[PDB]
Enzyme design. Sequence first.
Site, short mmCIF file in Angstrom:
data_model
loop_
_atom_site.label_atom_id
_atom_site.label_comp_id
_atom_site.label_asym_id
_atom_site.label_seq_id
_atom_site.Cartn_x
_atom_site.Cartn_y
_atom_site.Cartn_z
N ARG A 54 0.79 -1.24 -0.06
CA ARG A 54 -0.01 0.00 0.05
C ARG A 54 0.77 1.30 0.06
O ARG A 54 1.52 1.46 1.03
CB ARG A 54 -0.88 -0.09 1.28
CG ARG A 54 -1.77 1.01 1.17
CD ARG A 54 -3.13 0.78 2.08
NE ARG A 54 -2.86 1.39 3.34
CZ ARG A 54 -3.18 2.63 3.81
NH1 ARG A 54 -4.04 3.32 3.19
NH2 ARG A 54 -2.86 2.85 4.96
N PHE A 59 1.99 10.60 1.23
CA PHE A 59 1.39 10.26 2.44
C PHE A 59 2.43 9.25 2.86
O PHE A 59 3.39 9.78 3.99
CB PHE A 59 0.03 9.59 2.47
CG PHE A 59 -0.73 8.95 3.61
CD1 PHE A 59 0.01 9.40 4.83
CD2 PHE A 59 -1.48 8.06 3.70
CE1 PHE A 59 -0.60 8.89 6.07
CE2 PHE A 59 -2.12 7.38 4.72
CZ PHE A 59 -1.61 7.91 5.98
N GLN A 62 3.70 1.48 2.67
CA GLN A 62 3.38 0.78 3.65
C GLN A 62 3.68 -0.95 3.44
O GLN A 62 3.46 -1.12 2.09
CB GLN A 62 1.86 0.76 4.07
CG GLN A 62 1.43 -0.13 5.36
CD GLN A 62 -0.17 0.03 5.81
OE1 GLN A 62 -0.55 1.15 5.45
NE2 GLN A 62 -0.58 -1.14 6.30
N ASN A 101 -1.55 -0.46 12.00
CA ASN A 101 -2.39 -1.22 12.93
C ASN A 101 -3.86 -1.36 12.59
O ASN A 101 -4.27 -0.55 11.54
CB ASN A 101 -2.46 -0.58 14.49
CG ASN A 101 -2.83 0.56 14.62
OD1 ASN A 101 -3.83 1.01 14.25
ND2 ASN A 101 -1.83 1.56 15.39
N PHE A 112 4.98 1.48 8.12
CA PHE A 112 5.01 2.35 7.07
C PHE A 112 6.33 3.31 7.35
O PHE A 112 6.64 3.63 8.39
CB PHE A 112 3.65 3.15 7.12
CG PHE A 112 3.12 3.90 8.19
CD1 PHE A 112 2.61 3.42 9.13
CD2 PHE A 112 3.51 5.22 8.09
CE1 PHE A 112 2.07 3.84 10.26
CE2 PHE A 112 2.90 5.87 9.08
CZ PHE A 112 2.40 5.13 10.27
N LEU A 121 -1.61 10.90 13.06
CA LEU A 121 -1.25 9.77 13.69
C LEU A 121 -0.62 9.60 15.04
O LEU A 121 -0.66 8.32 15.75
CB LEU A 121 -0.66 8.91 12.51
CG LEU A 121 -1.07 8.69 11.24
CD1 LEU A 121 -0.22 7.93 10.28
CD2 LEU A 121 -2.50 8.41 11.16
N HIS A 125 -0.42 5.45 16.31
CA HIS A 125 0.42 4.59 15.71
C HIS A 125 1.88 4.86 16.63
O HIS A 125 2.26 5.89 16.47
CB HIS A 125 0.88 4.77 14.15
CG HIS A 125 -0.40 4.54 13.39
ND1 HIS A 125 -0.65 3.37 12.90
CD2 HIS A 125 -1.76 5.16 13.48
CE1 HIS A 125 -1.77 3.32 12.50
NE2 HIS A 125 -2.63 4.71 12.58
C1 LIG Z 1 -0.61 4.83 7.64
C2 LIG Z 1 -0.80 3.65 8.35
O1 LIG Z 1 -2.28 3.17 8.26
C3 LIG Z 1 -2.62 2.00 8.86
O2 LIG Z 1 -2.31 1.59 9.75
C4 LIG Z 1 -3.96 1.68 8.36
N1 LIG Z 1 -4.81 0.36 8.89
C5 LIG Z 1 -4.13 -0.57 8.20
O3 LIG Z 1 -3.64 -0.61 6.94
N2 LIG Z 1 -4.64 -1.69 8.73
C6 LIG Z 1 -4.29 -3.16 8.08
C7 LIG Z 1 -3.54 -3.73 9.52
C8 LIG Z 1 -2.27 -3.30 9.77
C9 LIG Z 1 -1.66 -3.83 10.85
C10 LIG Z 1 -2.19 -5.00 11.43
C11 LIG Z 1 -3.24 -5.55 10.87
C12 LIG Z 1 -3.68 -6.80 11.56
C13 LIG Z 1 -4.11 -6.80 12.78
C14 LIG Z 1 -4.49 -8.22 13.25
C15 LIG Z 1 -4.84 -9.11 12.62
N3 LIG Z 1 -4.63 -8.94 11.08
C16 LIG Z 1 -4.04 -7.98 10.77
C17 LIG Z 1 -3.79 -5.04 9.84
#
Ligand SMILES: CCOC(=O)CNC(=O)NCc1cccc(-c2cccnc2)c1
Length: 164
Positions: A54, A59, A62, A101, A112, A121, A125
Amino acid sequence: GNPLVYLDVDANGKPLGRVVLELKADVVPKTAENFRALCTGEKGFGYKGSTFHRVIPSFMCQAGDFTNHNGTGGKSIYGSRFPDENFTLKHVGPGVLSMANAGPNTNGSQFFICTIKTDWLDGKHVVFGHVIEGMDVVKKIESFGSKSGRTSKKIVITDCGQLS
Ligand SMILES: CCOC(=O)CNC(=O)NCc1cccc(-c2cccnc2)c1
Ligand SMILES: [K+]
């Protein structure tokens, strides 16, 4: 001292270069140790061979979903998720390294690298490091993203490890 680690990144099999990261073990020892160990692969799993799934220009870039390669997976060296360690370090600018997360206390392996200041954030985060070298490499990764986050080329951490 704080670990220095590296990610060697390619785009559709072509090398982009090396990103070197400092891990702030002095402020977030457990989050730093997780990432360090996932770079070396010493636990029998980690980032080598996984992708930046991603990437949003202006921005962040990731990565770290080394199980499902799309944002739904990853895991830590501790178990599937671990707590938010602290929010002492802030998203002060480009080059900040921070945990992705799915809400409070859901850190795994996704992370990221910021390409702008992402202060909204802060307290949400866990920041745990920053780019020492290879922000130009980050900028190349950023160039293959899109506003939707989808990448136009397959962006792969072909190697990774610890320098010191
Ligand atoms: C810029 C940062 O953006 C973000 O974190 C936006 N959120 C995501 O991308 N979430 C996706 C994501 C990120 C981290 C952990 C998990 C996870 C946790 C538990 C079980 N399975 C997967 C999911
Ligand atoms: K936006």
